[PDB]
């Protein structure tokens, strides 16, 4: 009952967080690259697909991918469509970091008040 239910709850809860963190880790990579190159970033369907098993150490076709915490988290977002863009993920529910709305498909690099920079900050705040 109570101790063991709690134990299972926490184990599951931890897997969820670990998955989400791993996703935000991939998203933070993309951003950091754009910042390093002084370039813009595309977070729409022209950016990377986050429902790629290879992003999480699984080969394509591996049947266990479908049973992964990553797939569990990603496929249950209201934005999931088989694919899932950065924007889809960030604006998708339910996840432990909530939702970002008013997201644009593209953030251009600009010398002053860098859009990509402002994107980086808000994602950074969510991935913490």
């Amino acid at each position, epitope marked *: 009952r109570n101790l063991n239910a709690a134990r299972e709850l926490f184990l599951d809860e931890l897997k969820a967080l670990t998955a989400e963190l791993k996703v935000y880790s991939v998203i933070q990579s993309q951003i950091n690259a754009a910042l390093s190159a002084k370039q813009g970033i595309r977070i729409d369907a022209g950016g990377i697909d986050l429902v790629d098993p290879t992003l999480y150490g699984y080969a394509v076709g591996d049947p266990r991918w479908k049973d992964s915490p990553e797939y569990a988290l990603l496929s249950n977002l209201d934005t999931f469509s088989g694919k899932l863009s950065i924007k889809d993920f960030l604006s998708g529910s339910p996840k432990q970091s909530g939702e970002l*709305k*008013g997201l644009s498909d593209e953030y251009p690099f600009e010398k002053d008040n860098n859009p990509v920079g402002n994107f980086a900050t808000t994602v950074s705040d969510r991935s913490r």
Partner: antibody
Framework: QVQLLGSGGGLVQPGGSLRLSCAASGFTFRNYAMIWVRQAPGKGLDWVSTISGTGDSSDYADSVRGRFTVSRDNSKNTLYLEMNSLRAEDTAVFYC??????????????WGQGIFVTVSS | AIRMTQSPSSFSASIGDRVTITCRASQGISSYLAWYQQKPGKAPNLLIYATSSLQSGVPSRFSGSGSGTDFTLTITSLQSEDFATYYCQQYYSHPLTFGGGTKVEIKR
């Protein structure tokens, strides 16, 4: 100075339409997600809609879904709220507001002065 | 909607009083809470974001704290020009929701 000059308010018949307008200056508008907030007489603040910087994404409170449309003109630096099928309950002051940081709609450092909407026959 | 329950809905205090406004969320919202001041017949002004980051230009007598579900706005030394209505606002998720507001009045 940062400014958001609102207009397009006023008196309208029940069932009628209005187009609220908010002209932005003093910041690079196209880099800020924006919101509309309403405040009914003697009531608190209610979020109405959100629009992304480029205007390629928008969200709405369930009560205005379908009958309100948010839009923006980034060349002219204008924010719009088209309002149709208006009800007495829509009578309120409307504020446009810019996100502090811009990339998403979260918390809002600049708010336009309220636009009065009265719905009455 | 994440419901934000603000309390109290109003109070009177003397100048110099320390005053505390409470905001409770219907679910966890981590730190994604902000506070606004609204002087009568004016648009709101941002006081605090991220639970406790003070907005540039705001006096330090305003401070925010909380975690998850319970949030507080403190005015540590109330002044005559603090007469306003104060709202909390969550931004953990959409729709963005605001507290009912606390009207602060001033005894003299």
């Amino acid at each position: 100075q940062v400014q958001l000059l609102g207009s397009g308010g006023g008196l309208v018949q029940p069932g009628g339409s209005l187009r609220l307008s908010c002209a932005a200056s003093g910041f690079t508008f196209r880099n800020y997600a924006m919101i509309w907030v309403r405040q009914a007489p003697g009531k608190g603040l209610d979020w109405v809609s959100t629009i992304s910087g480029t205007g390629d994404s928008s969200d709405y409170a369930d009560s205005v879904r379908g009958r309100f449309t948010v839009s923006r003109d980034n060349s002219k630096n204008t924010l719009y709220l088209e309002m149709n099928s208006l009800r007495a309950e829509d009578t309120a002051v409307f504020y446009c507001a810019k996100d502090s940081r811009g990339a998403a709609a979260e918390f809002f450092d600049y708010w336009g002065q309220g636009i009065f909407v009265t719905v009455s026959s | 909607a994440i419901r934000m329950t603000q309390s109290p809905s109003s109070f009177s205090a003397s100048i110099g009083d320390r005053v505390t406004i409470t905001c409770r969320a219907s679910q966890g919202i981590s730190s994604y809470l902000a506070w606004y001041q609204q002087k009568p017949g004016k648009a709101p002004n941002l006081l605090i974001y991220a639970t406790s980051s003070l907005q540039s230009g705001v006096p330090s007598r305003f401070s925010g704290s909380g975690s998850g579900t319970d949030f507080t706005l403190t005015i540590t030394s109330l002044q005559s020009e603090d007469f306003a209505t104060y709202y909390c606002q969550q931004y953990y998720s959409h729709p963005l929701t605001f507290g009912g507001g606390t009207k602060v009045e001033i005894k003299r």
